[PDB]
Design a protein around this ligand. Structure first.
Ligand SMILES: Cc1cc2nc3c(=O)[nH]c(=O)nc-3n(C[C@H](O)[C@H](O)[C@H](O)COP(=O)(O)OP(=O)(O)OC[C@H]3O[C@@H](n4cnc5c(N)ncnc54)[C@H](O)[C@@H]3O)c2cc1C
Length: 340
Protein backbone atom coordinates (compact mmCIF):
# COMPACT_ATOMS: atom_id res chain seq x y z
CA UNK A 1 0.00 0.00 0.00
CA UNK A 2 3.26 2.27 -0.51
CA UNK A 3 3.69 4.88 -3.21
CA UNK A 4 -0.06 5.43 -2.98
CA UNK A 5 -0.83 8.83 -4.33
CA UNK A 6 -3.15 10.80 -2.04
CA UNK A 7 -5.38 13.15 -3.96
CA UNK A 8 -6.72 16.28 -2.27
CA UNK A 9 -4.66 15.62 0.91
CA UNK A 10 -5.05 17.97 3.89
CA UNK A 11 -1.72 19.51 4.72
CA UNK A 12 -2.10 20.11 8.48
CA UNK A 13 -0.45 16.75 9.38
CA UNK A 14 2.36 17.67 7.06
CA UNK A 15 3.68 21.00 8.29
CA UNK A 16 4.12 22.45 11.84
CA UNK A 17 2.19 25.77 11.27
CA UNK A 18 -0.81 23.43 11.04
CA UNK A 19 -2.63 25.86 8.74
CA UNK A 20 -5.80 24.54 7.04
CA UNK A 21 -4.90 23.79 3.35
CA UNK A 22 -4.69 21.01 0.80
CA UNK A 23 -2.47 19.54 -1.94
CA UNK A 24 -3.68 18.29 -5.32
CA UNK A 25 -1.50 15.24 -4.79
CA UNK A 26 0.71 13.86 -2.10
CA UNK A 27 2.88 10.78 -1.81
CA UNK A 28 5.21 9.28 0.82
CA UNK A 29 8.65 8.15 -0.45
CA UNK A 30 10.37 5.48 1.63
CA UNK A 31 13.41 4.46 -0.48
CA UNK A 32 15.98 5.75 -3.04
CA UNK A 33 14.04 3.79 -5.61
CA UNK A 34 10.78 5.58 -4.74
CA UNK A 35 12.49 8.98 -5.28
CA UNK A 36 13.94 7.68 -8.49
CA UNK A 37 10.52 6.55 -9.76
CA UNK A 38 8.97 9.83 -8.54
CA UNK A 39 11.52 12.21 -10.03
CA UNK A 40 13.35 10.31 -12.81
CA UNK A 41 10.65 8.47 -14.69
CA UNK A 42 7.81 9.23 -17.14
CA UNK A 43 5.17 8.45 -14.50
CA UNK A 44 4.37 11.65 -12.56
CA UNK A 45 6.56 13.63 -14.95
CA UNK A 46 3.32 15.68 -15.33
CA UNK A 47 3.29 17.34 -11.88
CA UNK A 48 5.66 19.86 -10.39
CA UNK A 49 6.95 18.27 -7.15
CA UNK A 50 7.84 19.71 -3.77
CA UNK A 51 10.00 17.59 -1.56
CA UNK A 52 9.19 18.08 2.17
CA UNK A 53 10.48 16.59 5.43
CA UNK A 54 8.37 17.61 8.43
CA UNK A 55 7.21 20.99 6.92
CA UNK A 56 8.74 22.64 9.98
CA UNK A 57 10.29 25.39 7.84
CA UNK A 58 7.38 25.97 5.47
CA UNK A 59 4.28 28.08 4.93
CA UNK A 60 1.65 27.02 2.31
CA UNK A 61 0.15 30.14 1.07
CA UNK A 62 -2.63 28.69 -1.16
CA UNK A 63 -4.06 25.42 -2.66
CA UNK A 64 -1.00 23.43 -3.59
CA UNK A 65 -1.53 22.26 -7.13
CA UNK A 66 1.60 20.08 -7.57
CA UNK A 67 2.54 16.81 -5.96
CA UNK A 68 3.98 16.95 -2.50
CA UNK A 69 6.69 14.28 -1.92
CA UNK A 70 7.09 13.35 1.73
CA UNK A 71 10.61 12.22 2.55
CA UNK A 72 10.49 9.18 4.84
CA UNK A 73 13.68 7.31 3.74
CA UNK A 74 14.81 5.55 7.00
CA UNK A 75 18.12 4.09 8.19
CA UNK A 76 20.95 4.93 10.54
CA UNK A 77 24.23 3.05 10.10
CA UNK A 78 27.07 3.49 12.55
CA UNK A 79 30.73 2.87 12.43
CA UNK A 80 33.81 4.09 14.20
CA UNK A 81 37.56 4.80 13.96
CA UNK A 82 40.14 5.04 16.61
CA UNK A 83 39.40 8.78 16.27
CA UNK A 84 35.76 9.11 15.08
CA UNK A 85 32.22 8.01 15.00
CA UNK A 86 30.59 8.15 11.64
CA UNK A 87 26.98 7.75 10.87
CA UNK A 88 25.25 7.36 7.58
CA UNK A 89 21.76 8.69 8.10
CA UNK A 90 18.93 8.25 5.58
CA UNK A 91 17.36 11.58 4.71
CA UNK A 92 13.96 10.85 6.05
CA UNK A 93 15.06 10.09 9.60
CA UNK A 94 13.44 12.24 12.27
CA UNK A 95 16.03 14.72 13.62
CA UNK A 96 14.99 15.08 17.30
CA UNK A 97 14.91 11.21 17.39
CA UNK A 98 18.39 10.99 15.82
CA UNK A 99 19.93 13.33 18.38
CA UNK A 100 18.31 11.29 21.16
CA UNK A 101 19.76 8.17 19.70
CA UNK A 102 23.29 9.60 19.52
CA UNK A 103 23.02 10.72 23.10
CA UNK A 104 21.78 7.32 24.25
CA UNK A 105 24.64 5.57 22.26
CA UNK A 106 27.15 7.85 24.02
CA UNK A 107 27.98 9.53 20.69
CA UNK A 108 29.02 13.06 21.62
CA UNK A 109 28.68 16.18 19.46
CA UNK A 110 25.09 16.40 18.19
CA UNK A 111 23.46 17.35 21.48
CA UNK A 112 23.23 21.19 20.99
CA UNK A 113 20.97 20.34 18.01
CA UNK A 114 18.53 18.50 20.27
CA UNK A 115 14.80 18.74 19.41
CA UNK A 116 15.15 20.73 16.20
CA UNK A 117 12.12 19.41 14.24
CA UNK A 118 12.77 18.08 10.74
CA UNK A 119 14.26 15.20 8.73
CA UNK A 120 18.06 14.49 8.60
CA UNK A 121 17.91 15.15 4.83
CA UNK A 122 16.61 18.69 5.43
CA UNK A 123 19.39 19.50 7.96
CA UNK A 124 21.94 20.54 5.39
CA UNK A 125 19.48 22.64 3.30
CA UNK A 126 19.45 25.48 5.84
CA UNK A 127 22.53 24.36 7.75
CA UNK A 128 20.47 24.03 11.00
CA UNK A 129 22.09 25.52 14.08
CA UNK A 130 21.37 26.22 17.76
CA UNK A 131 23.31 26.83 20.98
CA UNK A 132 26.46 27.61 18.99
CA UNK A 133 26.58 24.51 16.71
CA UNK A 134 25.56 24.18 13.08
CA UNK A 135 25.18 21.18 10.88
CA UNK A 136 28.37 22.02 8.91
CA UNK A 137 30.31 21.39 12.17
CA UNK A 138 29.25 17.65 12.29
CA UNK A 139 28.86 17.06 8.57
CA UNK A 140 31.12 14.55 6.74
CA UNK A 141 29.16 14.53 3.47
CA UNK A 142 25.76 14.86 1.93
CA UNK A 143 24.36 12.41 -0.65
CA UNK A 144 21.67 13.39 -3.05
CA UNK A 145 19.62 12.10 -5.97
CA UNK A 146 20.78 14.12 -8.90
CA UNK A 147 17.72 15.08 -10.86
CA UNK A 148 19.69 15.29 -14.11
CA UNK A 149 21.23 11.86 -13.98
CA UNK A 150 18.87 9.76 -11.92
CA UNK A 151 21.86 8.64 -9.81
CA UNK A 152 23.04 9.40 -6.28
CA UNK A 153 25.96 11.86 -5.93
CA UNK A 154 28.02 12.85 -2.92
CA UNK A 155 29.30 16.27 -1.75
CA UNK A 156 31.93 16.73 0.92
CA UNK A 157 31.05 19.18 3.72
CA UNK A 158 33.22 21.71 1.78
CA UNK A 159 31.35 21.30 -1.42
CA UNK A 160 28.08 21.99 0.35
CA UNK A 161 29.01 25.64 0.63
CA UNK A 162 27.44 26.02 4.08
CA UNK A 163 26.72 29.46 5.46
CA UNK A 164 24.44 30.84 8.14
CA UNK A 165 21.03 29.28 7.20
CA UNK A 166 22.51 28.61 3.79
CA UNK A 167 23.94 25.98 1.48
CA UNK A 168 24.44 24.95 -2.22
CA UNK A 169 20.93 23.29 -2.12
CA UNK A 170 19.47 26.75 -1.91
CA UNK A 171 21.58 27.86 -4.92
CA UNK A 172 23.14 25.81 -7.71
CA UNK A 173 21.41 22.63 -6.43
CA UNK A 174 18.06 24.23 -5.76
CA UNK A 175 15.36 22.05 -7.35
CA UNK A 176 18.12 19.83 -8.89
CA UNK A 177 18.84 17.63 -5.90
CA UNK A 178 16.92 15.52 -3.44
CA UNK A 179 19.08 14.79 -0.44
CA UNK A 180 18.92 11.07 0.26
CA UNK A 181 21.32 10.70 3.19
CA UNK A 182 23.73 12.68 5.41
CA UNK A 183 27.19 11.59 6.62
CA UNK A 184 27.89 12.75 10.18
CA UNK A 185 31.34 12.70 11.76
CA UNK A 186 32.10 13.10 15.47
CA UNK A 187 35.42 13.13 17.26
CA UNK A 188 35.69 10.48 19.98
CA UNK A 189 37.43 13.07 22.15
CA UNK A 190 34.21 14.99 22.65
CA UNK A 191 34.22 18.71 23.50
CA UNK A 192 31.18 20.27 25.10
CA UNK A 193 30.07 23.47 23.39
CA UNK A 194 28.73 25.41 26.30
CA UNK A 195 28.70 29.22 25.80
CA UNK A 196 25.07 29.81 24.89
CA UNK A 197 21.90 30.48 26.94
CA UNK A 198 21.50 28.18 29.95
CA UNK A 199 24.46 25.99 28.91
CA UNK A 200 26.68 28.70 30.40
CA UNK A 201 25.89 27.24 33.83
CA UNK A 202 27.49 23.99 32.88
CA UNK A 203 31.09 23.27 33.38
CA UNK A 204 33.53 21.95 30.88
CA UNK A 205 33.86 18.46 32.33
CA UNK A 206 30.12 17.68 32.13
CA UNK A 207 28.68 14.68 30.28
CA UNK A 208 26.93 14.53 26.93
CA UNK A 209 23.74 13.77 28.74
CA UNK A 210 24.16 16.92 30.97
CA UNK A 211 24.29 19.14 27.92
CA UNK A 212 21.41 17.33 26.17
CA UNK A 213 19.11 17.55 29.21
CA UNK A 214 19.73 21.33 29.47
CA UNK A 215 19.06 21.94 25.82
CA UNK A 216 15.87 19.94 25.92
CA UNK A 217 14.83 21.64 29.12
CA UNK A 218 15.28 25.22 27.81
CA UNK A 219 13.77 24.53 24.41
CA UNK A 220 10.66 22.83 25.78
CA UNK A 221 10.33 25.87 28.05
CA UNK A 222 10.72 28.65 25.42
CA UNK A 223 9.44 27.21 22.16
CA UNK A 224 5.79 26.22 21.70
CA UNK A 225 5.29 22.64 20.72
CA UNK A 226 3.61 22.96 17.28
CA UNK A 227 1.08 20.19 18.00
CA UNK A 228 -0.17 22.67 20.63
CA UNK A 229 0.23 25.88 18.74
CA UNK A 230 1.42 25.71 15.17
CA UNK A 231 4.56 27.53 14.19
CA UNK A 232 7.73 27.20 12.05
CA UNK A 233 10.20 28.29 14.70
CA UNK A 234 12.14 31.52 14.38
CA UNK A 235 10.34 33.24 11.46
CA UNK A 236 13.29 35.52 10.55
CA UNK A 237 17.04 35.02 10.33
CA UNK A 238 19.31 37.11 12.54
CA UNK A 239 20.47 39.85 10.18
CA UNK A 240 24.21 39.95 9.58
CA UNK A 241 25.63 43.48 9.10
CA UNK A 242 29.20 44.93 8.87
CA UNK A 243 31.15 45.88 11.94
CA UNK A 244 30.85 49.54 11.08
CA UNK A 245 27.13 49.08 10.36
CA UNK A 246 26.77 47.55 13.79
CA UNK A 247 28.75 50.31 15.53
CA UNK A 248 26.48 52.88 13.89
CA UNK A 249 23.37 50.97 15.15
CA UNK A 250 24.90 50.64 18.53
CA UNK A 251 25.30 54.43 18.92
CA UNK A 252 21.51 54.84 19.05
CA UNK A 253 20.94 51.51 20.70
CA UNK A 254 23.91 50.84 23.06
CA UNK A 255 21.92 47.88 24.48
CA UNK A 256 21.71 45.92 21.16
CA UNK A 257 22.48 42.15 21.30
CA UNK A 258 25.00 40.57 18.97
CA UNK A 259 26.10 37.11 18.06
CA UNK A 260 29.41 36.02 16.56
CA UNK A 261 29.92 35.83 12.76
CA UNK A 262 33.08 35.77 10.69
CA UNK A 263 31.82 38.34 8.17
CA UNK A 264 30.53 41.38 10.15
CA UNK A 265 28.10 41.18 13.12
CA UNK A 266 25.00 39.01 13.55
CA UNK A 267 22.34 40.95 15.46
CA UNK A 268 19.73 39.18 17.65
CA UNK A 269 16.40 39.67 15.88
CA UNK A 270 14.55 38.47 19.00
CA UNK A 271 15.94 41.47 20.79
CA UNK A 272 15.10 43.85 17.87
CA UNK A 273 11.48 42.64 17.78
CA UNK A 274 11.14 42.72 21.54
CA UNK A 275 12.54 46.31 21.87
CA UNK A 276 10.39 47.34 18.94
CA UNK A 277 7.60 46.37 21.39
CA UNK A 278 6.12 43.56 19.21
CA UNK A 279 5.74 40.74 21.83
CA UNK A 280 2.20 39.45 21.87
CA UNK A 281 1.16 41.36 18.73
CA UNK A 282 -1.63 39.62 16.85
CA UNK A 283 -3.15 39.77 13.40
CA UNK A 284 -6.09 37.32 12.86
CA UNK A 285 -4.90 33.96 14.23
CA UNK A 286 -1.17 34.81 14.06
CA UNK A 287 0.72 36.14 17.09
CA UNK A 288 4.26 37.08 18.15
CA UNK A 289 4.97 34.65 21.02
CA UNK A 290 6.01 36.68 24.13
CA UNK A 291 8.66 34.13 25.37
CA UNK A 292 10.56 33.99 22.13
CA UNK A 293 9.66 36.90 19.96
CA UNK A 294 11.07 35.54 16.68
CA UNK A 295 8.40 32.80 16.67
CA UNK A 296 5.08 33.63 15.00
CA UNK A 297 2.54 31.18 16.38
CA UNK A 298 -0.81 30.06 15.09
CA UNK A 299 -3.18 30.63 18.03
CA UNK A 300 -5.67 28.20 16.40
CA UNK A 301 -7.30 29.80 13.32
CA UNK A 302 -4.46 31.54 11.47
CA UNK A 303 -4.50 31.81 7.69
CA UNK A 304 -1.15 32.07 5.77
CA UNK A 305 -2.31 35.66 5.09
CA UNK A 306 -2.29 36.35 8.83
CA UNK A 307 1.21 35.04 9.20
CA UNK A 308 2.36 36.98 6.18
CA UNK A 309 0.78 40.22 7.33
CA UNK A 310 2.20 39.82 10.82
CA UNK A 311 5.67 39.16 9.27
CA UNK A 312 5.19 42.34 7.16
CA UNK A 313 4.15 44.34 10.22
CA UNK A 314 7.22 43.15 12.23
CA UNK A 315 9.62 43.77 9.41
CA UNK A 316 8.14 47.27 8.98
CA UNK A 317 8.37 48.20 12.60
CA UNK A 318 11.87 46.73 12.91
CA UNK A 319 13.12 48.68 9.82
CA UNK A 320 11.81 51.86 11.32
CA UNK A 321 13.32 51.55 14.76
CA UNK A 322 16.67 50.41 13.49
CA UNK A 323 16.93 50.82 9.74
CA UNK A 324 17.41 47.01 9.57
CA UNK A 325 15.69 44.73 7.14
CA UNK A 326 14.79 41.27 8.58
CA UNK A 327 14.88 38.34 6.17
CA UNK A 328 12.33 35.60 6.53
CA UNK A 329 13.79 32.13 7.08
CA UNK A 330 10.47 30.17 6.61
CA UNK A 331 9.88 29.10 2.96
CA UNK A 332 6.78 30.57 1.35
CA UNK A 333 5.02 28.07 -0.94
CA UNK A 334 2.71 29.15 -3.80
CA UNK A 335 0.76 26.88 -6.21
CA UNK A 336 3.92 24.91 -7.21
CA UNK A 337 7.14 26.14 -5.58
CA UNK A 338 8.39 29.16 -3.46
CA UNK A 339 7.33 32.74 -3.90
CA UNK A 340 8.83 36.22 -3.07
C1 LIG B 1 9.51 24.60 16.95
C2 LIG B 1 10.60 24.75 15.90
C3 LIG B 1 11.91 25.04 16.32
C4 LIG B 1 12.94 25.21 15.38
N1 LIG B 1 14.24 25.43 15.83
C5 LIG B 1 15.24 25.55 14.88
C6 LIG B 1 16.56 25.81 15.28
O1 LIG B 1 16.90 25.89 16.50
N2 LIG B 1 17.51 25.92 14.31
C7 LIG B 1 17.22 25.83 12.96
O2 LIG B 1 18.09 25.99 12.10
N3 LIG B 1 15.94 25.61 12.55
C8 LIG B 1 14.93 25.49 13.52
N4 LIG B 1 13.64 25.28 13.08
C9 LIG B 1 13.37 25.27 11.60
C10 LIG B 1 13.47 23.84 11.06
O3 LIG B 1 13.38 22.92 12.14
C11 LIG B 1 14.67 23.51 10.18
O4 LIG B 1 14.79 24.43 9.10
C12 LIG B 1 14.61 22.11 9.59
O5 LIG B 1 15.88 21.81 8.99
C13 LIG B 1 13.55 21.88 8.50
O6 LIG B 1 13.30 20.48 8.35
P1 LIG B 1 12.01 19.93 7.54
O7 LIG B 1 12.29 18.46 7.49
O8 LIG B 1 10.74 20.37 8.25
O9 LIG B 1 12.08 20.71 6.17
P2 LIG B 1 10.81 21.27 5.43
O10 LIG B 1 10.10 22.41 6.06
O11 LIG B 1 9.90 20.10 5.08
O12 LIG B 1 11.48 21.76 4.06
C14 LIG B 1 12.35 22.89 4.09
C15 LIG B 1 12.99 23.10 2.73
O13 LIG B 1 13.91 22.06 2.36
C16 LIG B 1 13.53 21.45 1.14
N5 LIG B 1 13.77 20.00 1.34
C17 LIG B 1 13.18 19.20 2.31
N6 LIG B 1 13.71 17.95 2.20
C18 LIG B 1 14.60 17.92 1.17
C19 LIG B 1 15.42 16.90 0.65
N7 LIG B 1 15.44 15.64 1.11
N8 LIG B 1 16.24 17.21 -0.38
C20 LIG B 1 16.28 18.49 -0.90
N9 LIG B 1 15.46 19.47 -0.40
C21 LIG B 1 14.66 19.21 0.65
C22 LIG B 1 12.05 21.78 1.04
O14 LIG B 1 11.61 21.63 -0.27
C23 LIG B 1 11.92 23.17 1.61
O15 LIG B 1 12.43 24.08 0.67
C24 LIG B 1 12.64 25.12 14.02
C25 LIG B 1 11.35 24.84 13.58
C26 LIG B 1 10.33 24.67 14.52
C27 LIG B 1 8.91 24.41 14.03
Amino acid sequence: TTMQIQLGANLKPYHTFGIEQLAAQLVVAESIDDLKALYCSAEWASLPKLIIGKGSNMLFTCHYTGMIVVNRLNGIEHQQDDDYHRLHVAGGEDWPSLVSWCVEQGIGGLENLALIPGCAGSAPIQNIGAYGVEFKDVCDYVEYLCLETGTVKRLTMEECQFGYRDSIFKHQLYQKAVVTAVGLKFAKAWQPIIQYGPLKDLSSDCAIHDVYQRVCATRMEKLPDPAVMGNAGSFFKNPVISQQAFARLQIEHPDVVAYPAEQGVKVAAGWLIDQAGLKGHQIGGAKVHPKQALVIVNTGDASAQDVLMLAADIQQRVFNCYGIELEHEVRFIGESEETN
